[PDB]
Amino acid sequence: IDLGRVIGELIDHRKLIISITSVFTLFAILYALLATPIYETDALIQIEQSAPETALLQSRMILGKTIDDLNLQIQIEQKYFPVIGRGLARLMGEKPGNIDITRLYLPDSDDISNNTPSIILTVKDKENYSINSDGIQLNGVVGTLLNEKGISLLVNEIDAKPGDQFVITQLPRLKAISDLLKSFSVADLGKDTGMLTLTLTGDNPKRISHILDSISQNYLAQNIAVRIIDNAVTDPNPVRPKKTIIIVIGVVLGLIVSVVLVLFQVFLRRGIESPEQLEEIGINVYASIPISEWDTLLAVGNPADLAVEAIRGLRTSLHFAMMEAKNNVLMISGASPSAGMTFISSNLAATIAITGKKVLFIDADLRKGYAHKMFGHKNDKGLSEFLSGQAAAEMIIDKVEGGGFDYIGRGQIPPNPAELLMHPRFEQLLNWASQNYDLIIIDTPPILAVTDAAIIGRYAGTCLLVARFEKNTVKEIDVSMKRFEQSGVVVKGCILNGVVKKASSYYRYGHYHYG
Amino acid sequence: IDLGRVIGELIDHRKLIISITSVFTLFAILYALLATPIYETDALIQIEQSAPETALLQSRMILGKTIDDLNLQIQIEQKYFPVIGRGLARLMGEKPGNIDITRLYLPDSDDISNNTPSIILTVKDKENYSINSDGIQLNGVVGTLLNEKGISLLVNEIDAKPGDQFVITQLPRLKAISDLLKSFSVADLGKDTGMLTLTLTGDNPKRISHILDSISQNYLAQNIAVRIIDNAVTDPNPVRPKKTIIIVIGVVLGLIVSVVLVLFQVFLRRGIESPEQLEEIGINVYASIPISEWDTLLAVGNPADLAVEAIRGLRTSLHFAMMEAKNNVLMISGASPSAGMTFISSNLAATIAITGKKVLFIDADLRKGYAHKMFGHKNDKGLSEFLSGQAAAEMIIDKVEGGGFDYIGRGQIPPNPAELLMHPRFEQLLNWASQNYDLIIIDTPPILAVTDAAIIGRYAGTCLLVARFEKNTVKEIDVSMKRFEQSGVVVKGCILNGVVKKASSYYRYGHYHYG
Amino acid sequence: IDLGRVIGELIDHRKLIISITSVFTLFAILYALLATPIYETDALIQIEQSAPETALLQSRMILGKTIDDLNLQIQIEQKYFPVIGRGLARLMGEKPGNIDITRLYLPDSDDISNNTPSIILTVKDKENYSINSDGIQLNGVVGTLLNEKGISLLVNEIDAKPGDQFVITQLPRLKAISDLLKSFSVADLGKDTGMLTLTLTGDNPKRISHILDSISQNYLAQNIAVRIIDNAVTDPNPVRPKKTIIIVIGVVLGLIVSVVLVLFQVFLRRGIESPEQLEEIGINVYASIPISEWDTLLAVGNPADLAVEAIRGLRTSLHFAMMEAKNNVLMISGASPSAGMTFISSNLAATIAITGKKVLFIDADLRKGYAHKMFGHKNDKGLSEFLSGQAAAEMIIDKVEGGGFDYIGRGQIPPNPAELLMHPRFEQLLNWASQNYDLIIIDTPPILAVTDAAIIGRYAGTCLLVARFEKNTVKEIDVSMKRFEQSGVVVKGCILNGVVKKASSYYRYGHYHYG
Ligand SMILES: Nc1ncnc2c1ncn2[C@@H]1O[C@H](COP(=O)(O)OP(=O)(O)O)[C@@H](O)[C@H]1O
Ligand SMILES: Nc1ncnc2c1ncn2[C@@H]1O[C@H](COP(=O)(O)OP(=O)(O)O)[C@@H](O)[C@H]1O
Ligand SMILES: Nc1ncnc2c1ncn2[C@@H]1O[C@H](COP(=O)(O)OP(=O)(O)O)[C@@H](O)[C@H]1O
Numbered sequence A, B, C: 001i002d003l004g005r006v007i008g009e010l011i012d013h014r015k016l017i018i019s020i021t022s023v024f025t026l027f028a029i030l031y032a033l034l035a036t037p038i039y040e041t042d043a044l045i046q047i048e049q050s051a052p053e054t055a056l057l058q059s060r061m062i063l064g065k066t067i068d069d070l071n072l073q074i075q076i077e078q079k080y081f082p083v084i085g086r087g088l089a090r091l092m093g094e095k096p097g098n099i100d101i102t103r104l105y106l107p108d109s110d111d112i113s114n115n116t117p118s119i120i121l122t123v124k125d126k127e128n129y130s131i132n133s134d135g136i137q138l139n140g141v142v143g144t145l146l147n148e149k150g151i152s153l154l155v156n157e158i159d160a161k162p163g164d165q166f167v168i169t170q171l172p173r174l175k176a177i178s179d180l181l182k183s184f185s186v187a188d189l190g191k192d193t194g195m196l197t198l199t200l201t202g203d204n205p206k207r208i209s210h211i212l213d214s215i216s217q218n219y220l221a222q223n224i225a226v227r228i229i230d231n232a233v234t235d236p237n238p239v240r241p242k243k244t245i246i247i248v249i250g251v252v253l254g255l256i257v258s259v260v261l262v263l264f265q266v267f268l269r270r271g272i273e274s275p276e277q278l279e280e281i282g283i284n285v286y287a288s289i290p291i292s293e294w295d296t297l298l299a300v301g302n303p304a305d306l307a308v309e310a311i312r313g314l315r316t317s318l319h320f321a322m323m324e325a326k327n328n329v330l331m332i333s334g335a336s337p338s339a340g341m342t343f344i345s346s347n348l349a350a351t352i353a354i355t356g357k358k359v360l361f362i363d364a365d366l367r368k369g370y371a372h373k374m375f376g377h378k379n380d381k382g383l384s385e386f387l388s389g390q391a392a393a394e395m396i397i398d399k400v401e402g403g404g405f406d407y408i409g410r411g412q413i414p415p416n417p418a419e420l421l422m423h424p425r426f427e428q429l430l431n432w433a434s435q436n437y438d439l440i441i442i443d444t445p446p447i448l449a450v451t452d453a454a455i456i457g458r459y460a461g462t463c464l465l466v467a468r469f470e471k472n473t474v475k476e477i478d479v480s481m482k483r484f485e486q487s488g489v490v491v492k493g494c495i496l497n498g499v500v501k502k503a504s505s506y507y508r509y510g511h512y513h514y515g
């Protein structure tokens, strides 16, 4: 491989690359803007050692004392239903509410799993509130204590707007101690001095400084039954989430996944990409037809279409190839369905009719031929009725209205399509038509699916295959050619159909307007 | 690859290389001259240890004491609207102003984000000044204190020119302490001695020395409730920005980006560069025409042009190639539009007419032919009107004025250009003209876009393709030749057009004046 | 590559190699002889530790005390206008002057940048002197103090010759301390003993020893409020610049730059170097003509020239090649101008005329032919006038005086040179001349520039190309041959012209005298 190939591949897949990278970067931005910020407070302690003091600070006696002093076993969480409600509320500038609770005693359900009882408190005004544990609604008032239904609560100084809801949990003392220990750090910072740096993290910048001051006071008071050089203050800039590294990670991750996905698609492609793939195998390509982005004949509705220009190129190529052919019959076939055989056949018939030659178009697709719909029809008396013997050769020929050539439709779909085509009446029809017309074009079903084209091809002096631009593979076309050669039918060459513009190709068609 | 190639590439791209390097170096110089200089002061302290003293110096008690003593919570910034105003003002030799403020109390808005209140003070004279916080204009006088609108201010010794504006911020004490700590360093410098080196950086060389003296005095006074060997002095040479390394980095960065960009363009080029690329594929090149930097025929306006000399070379080559041709008709075509087919065709007709031969020029580009504009025209009765049957072969031929040959214009643009050219009247016209002229030159549309040239080429004894020097690729020309061969038209060879001088080429044309 | 090639390349480029190396070595010698010498003094101190004493010696208290004692803030510099004046003065044996100044007070301008005031003192005699700060001229006398114009000066013991000028600077105390600190070093030299080695460098060998003695005394005196084992003495041999390493570096740098430059030129050469380069491509070389270092014909002025000998070799080669040629016409052409086509053509005509054969020389360079100047002329009625029809074939032929052959000049420069040559009168002239002469030689313009030679070559039975020895490339000659072949002109072979002696060649011509 070379760099031009990969650059063209990136240019072609730019829509997917951009979409994937933008999606990943949007998710990264949403996380870096909706994650709750985490602040850090710290304090500095003087030791007159300092290895066992580190274990004494993190022990459950000191931390438990702090928790008892500060009532850290009463967890209060402002309620937002979604997982992004809190982040949005912070972004909108809404001030978070808080409640001071000095006494809480839940009935302590203490079942197998839920060791932490919790209730929901809804604020009705600055004074009263509603409480529900499991649907049991009670009304309480700030100030006066509540002792009802096995529930004790004392609420002071509700500072929020009415309608807010708060989850109040009474978690066990060990759970509180473990929570405090997880966010608490002690370090020496000199490895030999009596200086210890205590650190604490949390989402409330005032609460963490109060908690660290409590820890320092408890440790100092316990030791004298040590000097606090720096009492706890909180850095106002949150330490998490780290926004810029998150966004950079998101962008780079999006780019790498996009690149590997494009590499995956490029390594898994097998369709035809240029006429050179067919010409390596030894197959003549007579034209490349682009997709016309424009029940009508294209060569009649839009004669100045680019696909019709490419078909005029095919017309001039054929006028030279079909010299020294045994008769004036051309058969168009292909490997797979919807490659474009009917499109090519009918539009070629129209462009050859505009030059003043008499053209007969035969729809010999007895299984799915729709040419009568595309030309305007009297669907009676098609090729079926003629072959089965219930029609004559003069009742089946009709005129294309905006075209200028004659045609024969398929007729009624028969039960034995391949066997009807083997009747000698088919060759009688071809020999009769070959004397009243300058050209006969026969449209057929694909050869890999059924065998009708190989029957028809015995009486055609020229045979061309239609290959679809991206769908078909080189192996398919080669197998189709060999299946034709085995039945005694020589295939003159190929027509590539439905070509589109690709930056990776480096093959230049003339698929652009000139005028 | 070899070194001659890369040297030629650099010579060719020197304009881009020089421009990019000069832009990057100019940006580096602008930064190294507009960045505010940062000075450094330092002091030396004697310790009679020295590991915990390092943590005691950087603690908030000592630094906070210094900040309280020196009023470092009053931030004063001289106001320049742009981000380069201060640098320009320093470069112009303008002396920065300063104000001594001993008492500041802003109303402490203290909203969600802006924790630092700030006002703007405009100097009206040496005595009075104007103050605005949020549009509230007040007048104050140096000396007498101001207590108005919840704002307290005391300003002493305004030393600036009238019209200056200063931002006065009252930042919080922790913010001041963090600012001081960021620019403050303590080191041991012997790792065992009682010597400590204290360092401080900042943009004011006197303020930083005062701050470091205050820190040293506070630490010394606190310890005795230590010897200061060296009091703080400031190195007069700024430590940042480091100009020479910045400029060197800018130059080297410019060179590397230029080299990679030129390498990128060289690896992405696919156009034809020399006739050897076409001759490898097996295509005869009959001439290489340079760009003529000079609605007129070039071979008539400037007969001594270099392009006309190259076209005389083509004339002598053709006089030998067109021997043993079936008729005296030459068709010029090409792959893509604006390769130079009309330019070559018409100028070749002029140079062959000056040698005394009778020449007919036919503009068979029925879609975009403009030869009638370039020759001086009676636009009626062109090739269209003749082919469609509404004109005779004697009414369509006209004389080029400054030329010396006959011509046929396209006529009115028809709706069916390819089908008009297929009329037997075209061959009748060619056979009639072939007996009254020594040479007929036919100009055509490009073959990749439309098929008209392949129709015309059946009656031309000689056919040449025009390839544009840098635009076309070898694949394009090969595809054009094969599309012609498929239609039964043998292409004699190619003409390379619009060649220019490239140091990387190492192919020598004769594109220079001799006279 | 092999060693013989590179040795020959060095032999050929020896002039450049020697010049570059000599230039670099001369610059190195000039630096190593003009750089001011820097002396070193040192002293040895005993410590009864020694880690903090190192920081105490380099502190600003001790160094500042030394500077105050020795008045090191008075900088005196003897004035030389150029940057090599001092070095030359030292080399000429001139004794540097000195002035003892005990009191200096400049007005202390103290602007934004120039913190160091300076004045210029011009010595008028042993007693009086002139002083100028900014053009303000004052007269002072040794002894009596000066207090004028805000300037205080006391000068003692002027020891210099009259006319000398000295810059006297009053630099700030910190600048003096930093200057002293930069040149001062302290080391332990045992890493554990009480021995310290103090070192000081400077351009004055007595001043530095005095300064180091002052530093030692101040440190010793301060400590007792330490033993000086060795007081300061100066090594009389300067420590910088180190001459031999500088000169060796200069020589080696010159050699490496010379070698890379010669390698650069050798890798960038593309011209023809030997006839073998042309014979690989399949081109017969019939002669190699050397440069003749000798408006005259060389074969007449200096018949025993080496170039004329090589041309006699060409004459004998041609007498055998031109057998079985269709006529007796020889055309000489070439690729590029000033390859030597006229030189070869005319001198070949002279050497063939001395053998008793009748020779006609035709100057068919209608664009820049100067043969009439070189033969002695009647410039009227040349080839132009004949072709345009205004002269006959008998009025245009003239005699070369010192030669022995006939010639036709170009005539008046025409506006249509290529079209004049296409007249059938040219072939009439050639057919008439072919019956009255044994040989006709035609000189032409180069074929890459214009096409005239390809027109003339149709009527020449033999055609030779001239290639210039170093200017032309193999690609040029091959392109010229192919441009001739395309026009139906067969080129017999080549003549290499202007060959010179190259040690790298290893191709031996016979370009030496034999006689
Ligand atoms: N180059 C093309 N541009 C636009 N439409 C095309 C092109 N080729 C085929 N088609 C359309 O795509 C559809 C499938 O092609 P069709 O010719 O009917 O398939 P089949 O090979 O089975 O006979 C048709 O509706 C056809 O009109
Ligand atoms: N070697 C050239 N030097 C200067 N101008 C040129 C050269 N070749 C083409 N042109 C000019 O560039 C324009 C486009 O070329 P043209 O011959 O008209 O294109 P086309 O190939 O479509 O017929 C024209 O205006 C032409 O005169
Ligand atoms: N081998 C040579 N030795 C000395 N002078 C030479 C040699 N070859 C050419 N010259 C001189 O160098 C100049 C340029 O060569 P000239 O023959 O006039 O060039 P051109 O190829 O254009 O006809 C002339 O003055 C010529 O006399």
Ligand SMILES: [Mg+2]
Binding pocket: A341, A342, A343, A365, A444
């Ligand atoms: Mg179909």
Ligand SMILES: [Mg+2]
Binding pocket: B341, B342, B343, B365, B444
């Ligand atoms: Mg054109």
Ligand SMILES: [Mg+2]
Binding pocket: C341, C342, C343, C365, C444
């Ligand atoms: Mg000459």
